[PDB]
């Protein structure tokens, strides 16, 4: 029952800070992603709900 599996609404600064926390800047985000990739993250985490663990899998 780890808290990182609790889904929530990641919008605005919450989503930016969550990406810095679980995905980091070095590695995945060192290469710019696509606008469609960013559309899917906002859709799955801001419009819908996603967990920090689910967000980590988007960055592999």
Curated annotation (Swiss-Prot):
Sequence similarity: Belongs to the insulin family.
Chain's role: Insulin decreases blood glucose concentration. It increases cell permeability to monosaccharides, amino acids and fatty acids. It accelerates glycolysis, the pentose phosphate cycle, and glycogen synthesis in liver.
Disease tied to this entry: Hyperproinsulinemia: An autosomal dominant condition characterized by elevated levels of serum proinsulin-like material.
Entire-sequence positions represented here: 25 to 110 of 110
Organism: Homo sapiens
Disulphide bonds in the chain: 11-46, 23-59, 45-50
Record note on quaternary structure: Heterodimer of a B chain and an A chain linked by two disulfide bonds.
Compartments, as annotated in UniProt: Secreted
Protein name: Insulin
Superkingdom: Eukaryota
């Amino acid at each position: 029952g780890e808290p990182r599996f609790v889904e929530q609404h990641l919008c605005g600064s919450h989503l930016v800070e969550a990406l810095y926390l679980v995905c980091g800047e070095r590695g995945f985000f060192e290469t710019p992603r696509s606008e469609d990739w960013w559309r899917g993250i906002v859709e799955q985490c801001c419009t819908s709900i996603c967990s920090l663990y689910q967000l980590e899998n988007y960055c592999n």
